[PDB]
Design a protein around this ligand. Sequence first.
Ligand SMILES: NC(=O)c1ccc[n+]([C@@H]2O[C@H](COP(=O)([O-])OP(=O)(O)OC[C@H]3O[C@@H](n4cnc5c(N)ncnc54)[C@H](O)[C@@H]3O)[C@@H](O)[C@H]2O)c1
Ligand SMILES: NC(=O)c1ccc[n+]([C@@H]2O[C@H](COP(=O)([O-])OP(=O)(O)OC[C@H]3O[C@@H](n4cnc5c(N)ncnc54)[C@H](O)[C@@H]3O)[C@@H](O)[C@H]2O)c1
Ligand SMILES: NC(=O)c1ccc[n+]([C@@H]2O[C@H](COP(=O)([O-])OP(=O)(O)OC[C@H]3O[C@@H](n4cnc5c(N)ncnc54)[C@H](O)[C@@H]3O)[C@@H](O)[C@H]2O)c1
Ligand SMILES: NC(=O)c1ccc[n+]([C@@H]2O[C@H](COP(=O)([O-])OP(=O)(O)OC[C@H]3O[C@@H](n4cnc5c(N)ncnc54)[C@H](O)[C@@H]3O)[C@@H](O)[C@H]2O)c1
Ligand SMILES: Oc1cc(Cl)ccc1Oc1ccc(Cl)cc1Cl
Ligand SMILES: Oc1cc(Cl)ccc1Oc1ccc(Cl)cc1Cl
Ligand SMILES: Oc1cc(Cl)ccc1Oc1ccc(Cl)cc1Cl
Ligand SMILES: Oc1cc(Cl)ccc1Oc1ccc(Cl)cc1Cl
Lengths: 258, 259, 259, 257
Amino acid sequence: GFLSGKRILITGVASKLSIAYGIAQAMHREGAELAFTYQNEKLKGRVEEFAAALGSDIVLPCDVAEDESITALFTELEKVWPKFDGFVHSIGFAPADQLDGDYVDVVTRDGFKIAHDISAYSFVAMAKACRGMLNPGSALLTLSYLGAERAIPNYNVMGLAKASLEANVRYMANAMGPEGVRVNAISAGPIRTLAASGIKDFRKMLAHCEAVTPIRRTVTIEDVGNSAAFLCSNLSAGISGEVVHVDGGFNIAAMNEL
Amino acid sequence: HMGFLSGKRILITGVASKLSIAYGIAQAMHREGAELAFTYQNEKLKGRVEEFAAALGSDIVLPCDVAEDESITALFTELEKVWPKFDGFVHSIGFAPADQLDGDYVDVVTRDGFKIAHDISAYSFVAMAKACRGMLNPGSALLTLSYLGAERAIPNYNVMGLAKASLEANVRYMANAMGPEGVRVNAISAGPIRTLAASGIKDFRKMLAHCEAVTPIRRTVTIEDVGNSAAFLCSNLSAGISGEVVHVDGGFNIAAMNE
Amino acid sequence: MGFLSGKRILITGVASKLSIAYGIAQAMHREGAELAFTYQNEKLKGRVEEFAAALGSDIVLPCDVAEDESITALFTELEKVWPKFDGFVHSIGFAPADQLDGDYVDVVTRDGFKIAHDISAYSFVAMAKACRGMLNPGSALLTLSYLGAERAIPNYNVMGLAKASLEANVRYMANAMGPEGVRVNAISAGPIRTLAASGIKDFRKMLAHCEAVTPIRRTVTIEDVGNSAAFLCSNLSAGISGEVVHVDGGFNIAAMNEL
Amino acid sequence: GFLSGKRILITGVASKLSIAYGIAQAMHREGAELAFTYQNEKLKGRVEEFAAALGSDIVLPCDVAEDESITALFTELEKVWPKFDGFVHSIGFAPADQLDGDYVDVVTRDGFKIAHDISAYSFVAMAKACRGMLNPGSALLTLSYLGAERAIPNYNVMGLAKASLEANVRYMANAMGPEGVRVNAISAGPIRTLAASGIKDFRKMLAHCEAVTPIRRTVTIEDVGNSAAFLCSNLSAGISGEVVHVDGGFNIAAMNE
Ligand SMILES: NC(=O)c1ccc[n+]([C@@H]2O[C@H](COP(=O)([O-])OP(=O)(O)OC[C@H]3O[C@@H](n4cnc5c(N)ncnc54)[C@H](O)[C@@H]3O)[C@@H](O)[C@H]2O)c1
Ligand SMILES: NC(=O)c1ccc[n+]([C@@H]2O[C@H](COP(=O)([O-])OP(=O)(O)OC[C@H]3O[C@@H](n4cnc5c(N)ncnc54)[C@H](O)[C@@H]3O)[C@@H](O)[C@H]2O)c1
Ligand SMILES: NC(=O)c1ccc[n+]([C@@H]2O[C@H](COP(=O)([O-])OP(=O)(O)OC[C@H]3O[C@@H](n4cnc5c(N)ncnc54)[C@H](O)[C@@H]3O)[C@@H](O)[C@H]2O)c1
Ligand SMILES: NC(=O)c1ccc[n+]([C@@H]2O[C@H](COP(=O)([O-])OP(=O)(O)OC[C@H]3O[C@@H](n4cnc5c(N)ncnc54)[C@H](O)[C@@H]3O)[C@@H](O)[C@H]2O)c1
Ligand SMILES: Oc1cc(Cl)ccc1Oc1ccc(Cl)cc1Cl
Ligand SMILES: Oc1cc(Cl)ccc1Oc1ccc(Cl)cc1Cl
Ligand SMILES: Oc1cc(Cl)ccc1Oc1ccc(Cl)cc1Cl
Ligand SMILES: Oc1cc(Cl)ccc1Oc1ccc(Cl)cc1Cl
């Protein structure tokens, strides 16, 4: 596999639906050794099961809201992985009220702070915490959405948070590049996940994208998985600070329904 | 005066000194016939801002600390007393703790540092829009000030780059939300200009010199260049333009591989 | 006096009262410009003479941008009445009709691609080459582009490629001509019913779509584009070069609005 | 390998430094059957040799200035490859005079025509001539440069031709997507190739990019090759109409003192 010899930490595996689940399956297929985080105790058991089906018993708590939890993650991981080769940030949150209605009516200071803190800051927070553990040739990866570039109904403040996160990719790639670390994002098209369900009229976005995307289907966690595996491998040694659209080309289409 | 903003009432935030981008905008809007009102952050800036306002024929000078929801509500409660309706506002406000703007981004970025940059530099634009939405006339325009740091990794600009990316996305979401009721929302991506707050960016004087050398117009932009651009974007001349980040940087942003 | 007082601006692409260039001409004359006009061929000469006369000009000269000799003769004739001037509006676009109906790969041809690029993109720099010595300090060039440059729009086809080339032309001309005091910008205009627009398949559906989903909830007008164009060729926009300004009511920044 | 069972045609192999060389190596290594084109008789020997090193004896002429040359390529290719899974367009040309001096002084109608014709039109010309030979799941790839997005000294009219090429990618991705074909570009950082010599002060561009690129090195035909292999493989199934920057992140950097 093109990840033979790599040790990648994967965040954000909530279920078999999760983008991060797809990424893990592809990275295991390509020979990566994997470790896994879980947000809270409620999620531990399922992530342990998913971890074990991929030959891993490295499963550790991380609530990215808490600096101590991020430090503890890497404190505990260092004991099995003194050094490793990067991680997948597949984590977003905003209060539910932020994702239904007029952006300006519905956005709040606290909704804004949480969305950016959890979806944007958490990525560089994780990087600070493991910086000295990363081998030369390491790769970090986050997940963004066209909401960052365009005004999308109901996505609302998550658009601002993804725009922040995509700038984070750039500032992180620029800072960590010299010492041999690449940083990228996948801008993924719509996929049915627990989190997707939190966006008002998600199913309308999903249907619309299926119709007008050049490849004429919604992308799968397999498609994202393979792209993510590639971006965290030495195959992508020439790419850093990049937001790669894995949306079937939806972002480049205009006026297809009239 | 009389000009392309005759009939417009515009609120101006972020005047600190005569170097301030908001001063150049205030100058340019007065010259084009706008009635102006001003905000000041704290008591330290009140007196300075009052004399600037009086020189431009305004005695509407009101406190606003955009970290505080109470302060923004009270701004527009007081503003309503003299201006029941008005035609929008200029958001010329940035802030991060000093420690954010000096060193390797990953090393010096902090959670509070990130929180404060995004809160003051990005959230505060839509906060002001939420609290004055009902007072905006049809044909109103909101304007904010961004920087190329939103688009490119700039040494030492660090977490302000992310807060500016968030700001530019806010322009788009607000434009989209407010367009149907007749409100336009735009940004100017200004080139570097020696302002009080600019002195806080490590190596600013090298940015300035770099930008002077490679910018197509072969000069630094002025608060006059930005003021004329802001005056246009808040005027009915710009009626076909919403959700845009207009680069007023002499075209620095389109240059690569110079020298 | 208007913000174009003391400027001498040459206007191409006036075909009718619906032409973008005619809206530009009106706004620029309103703001105090003195104007000169080109006409493509003998059939348009009379109408352009009439529209120019209505804006206080009888400087009305043939220019077919297909021909190097025609562009040279234009500036050799112009110089006799305008030894110096302050820039020109390039409002010129053409591809063979067969290029703008069907699947882009089926319908695009080598000659169709050549003509689109030659007339719509190359002509902007050919004109700049031909008058470079006649431009005052503070001169400004303007071309017209379309969202088709950035996105794949059905049936705009190879005109999308020609517009992308044109916007790249804006950047390379801004960068080359900036040091000698010349600014170069584009307006990326929303759809407008003009003679040329009727050559685009389902243009009526395009208008209705942009009408529904554009933040400002209307079509832009030649007044909107004219006002922006006046601004971009005036000293008010002295800070802006190498820029494609979207004058499309925010259409470009909206996604999934139809639902 | 992840191109196992794919048939890819490769253009623009000139020498061992050729981006198209790096791409052939990477695609061979991952188990693609390759075919190669050569511009003219002068290059035919070098390519027949490079092809044989990779196990291909499919080496056909194509001058993309000629519609007939493109038809004939696909007429000959069909005899051995009735179907195939796409091609790599690694082809650029402008008259030498275009790439030395101030853009406005140096550009000419004929300079502009050829740059656009060879560097941009030829990509969709090849897609037109082979559309019915492409299997479901096929990928086309072209090579672009940041000259499309930024004004770069001396790159001049090639910048416009690459901007047209990048738009081409999007219009081809939109048209061909529904019949199961993806179309993408790599925007490669500077690399010393035969063609690169043609740019005035190319050396300075290399050293500039090397100094300020986040990965702090020049990219290689093997970095571009790995990215090209990926983008023409089923691994990239969710990517179309995309210009992927393989320049070490140079494009996102500004103000490196
Ligand atoms: N349509 C889509 O599914 C889509 C599109 C593009 C982008 N994305 C992004 O992909 C990523 C993965 O989301 P998904 O769609 O797979 O959803 P999901 O619900 O399957 O996964 C989201 C994950 O975020 C984690 N998370 C939330 N708050 C956390 C915290 N405080 N600490 C740690 N983990 C926390 C959850 O535990 C969960 O594992 C997100 O960043 C999302 O914004 C999703
Ligand atoms: N100067 C430049 O080179 C440049 C370039 C691009 C954009 N900008 C942006 O222009 C805007 C104005 O900055 P400037 O350069 O004029 O400097 P400045 O110091 O004159 O203006 C900054 C202003 O921010 C205000 N401010 C800070 N925190 C505030 C708060 N909590 N509540 C209310 N007001 C607050 C200050 O009172 C001050 O008036 C900012 O958004 C800045 O980021 C500056
Ligand atoms: N929706 C729109 O109408 C729209 C939107 C975006 C951009 N544009 C651009 O605006 C510009 C003006 O078009 P318009 O909509 O006003 O259409 P129009 O028909 O009013 O203008 C087209 C003009 O092009 C001129 N022209 C064509 N070939 C020429 C040649 N060889 N030499 C000289 N002049 C030549 C014609 O004489 C005519 O005056 C074009 O570049 C067009 O692509 C139009
Ligand atoms: N070298 C770089 O730094 C760099 C960076 C970005 C993109 N590119 C692009 O990569 C591609 C390959 O160039 P390279 O750097 O490998 O140089 P190269 O000289 O190795 O390859 C250029 C190729 O173009 C072919 N070609 C030229 N005119 C042709 C025609 N009429 N018909 C057929 N083939 C023709 C030549 O035969 C040659 O193989 C070009 O499109 C170039 O613009 C190069
Ligand atoms: O960002 C997303 C985009 C899409 Cl189309 C679908 C799911 C997404 O993921 C989220 C959406 C909202 C919240 Cl609150 C959290 C997350 Cl992770
Ligand atoms: O955003 C800016 C960009 C530049 Cl080039 C110069 C000044 C800027 O403005 C600020 C920079 C830092 C802080 Cl703390 C606050 C502000 Cl207002
Ligand atoms: O570019 C345009 C875009 C739009 Cl939406 C409408 C009209 C346009 O202008 C043209 C369209 C086709 C041809 Cl052949 C020539 C021109 Cl000037
Ligand atoms: O596009 C390129 C970009 C770079 Cl940085 C280097 C070489 C390139 O390729 C060319 C440059 C000039 C000519 Cl005439 C032909 C080609 Cl193929």
